[PDB]
Amino acid sequence: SDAPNFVLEDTNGKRIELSDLKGKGVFLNFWGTWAEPCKKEFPYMANQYKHFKSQGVEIVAVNVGESKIAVHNFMKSYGVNFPVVLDTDRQVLDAYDVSPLPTTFLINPEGKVVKVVTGTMTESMIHDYMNLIKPG
Q1: 49 with 82: CB under 8 angstroms?
Q2: Does residue 102 have a cis bond before it (omega within 30 degrees)?
Q3: Chain mean position to CA 85
Q4: CB 54 within 8 Å of CB 82
Q5: 3-state class of 107 per DSSP?
Q6: d(CA 13, CA 11)
Q7: Which residues fall within 8 angstroms of residue 75, CB to CB, at 6 or more apart?
Q8: Superfamily the domain 1-136 falls into
Q9: CA–CA distance from 102 to each of 20, 22, 23, 33, 64 (Å)?
Q10: By the 8 A CB rule, do 5 and 19 touch?
Q11: Domain residue spans of the chain
Q12: Rg of the Cα trace of the chain?
């Protein structure tokens, strides 16, 4: 199944379009600053990203509608080294039908959703999930 496309800005003002990431695996995470698992898992994603970025897996961490400041504070506290976008009208989260939070869509290099992950991820799981979607 094709991943619904979107254009949001990252937390530096830069336009990001999902379809422009074709060729790369996309670890697409919907998150809120109040979600306890995102507090645990953000540092794991950041540490796995040190390994996977240069292997052609991108993270797009879509914050579900919170202020620029609440997101910047979260990123700073949790050592974020990966892309964060702001879903300010909650339109991408609607497009994705995102219920539970966090939710992660694993999108392969061809732009298809290969797995939907809900609930809790270990760093080992995060590693395996990024291996799933990488080109190599």
Answers
A1: yes
A2: yes
A3: 9
A4: no
A5: strand
A6: 6
A7: 11, 84
A8: Glutaredoxin (3.40.30.10)
A9: 24, 23, 25, 10, 10
A10: yes
A11: 1-136
A12: 13
DSSP state of 5: P
* 88: nearest Cα among 59, 66, 110: 66
Structure tokens at 78: 């949790």
For 114, the enclosing helix (H) or strand (E) is strand 113-118
**In angstroms, rounded to a whole number, what is the distance separating the alpha carbons of residues 22 and 31?**
22
CA distances 10 to 88, 121, 129, Å, are: 11, 24, 23
Helix residue ranges per DSSP H, the chain: 36-52, 68-77, 91-96, 123-133
4 — alpha (psi -120 to 50), left (phi > 0) or beta?
Answer: beta
**Whole-angstrom Cα distance, residue 3 to residue 16?**
15
For 47, the token pair is 């540490």
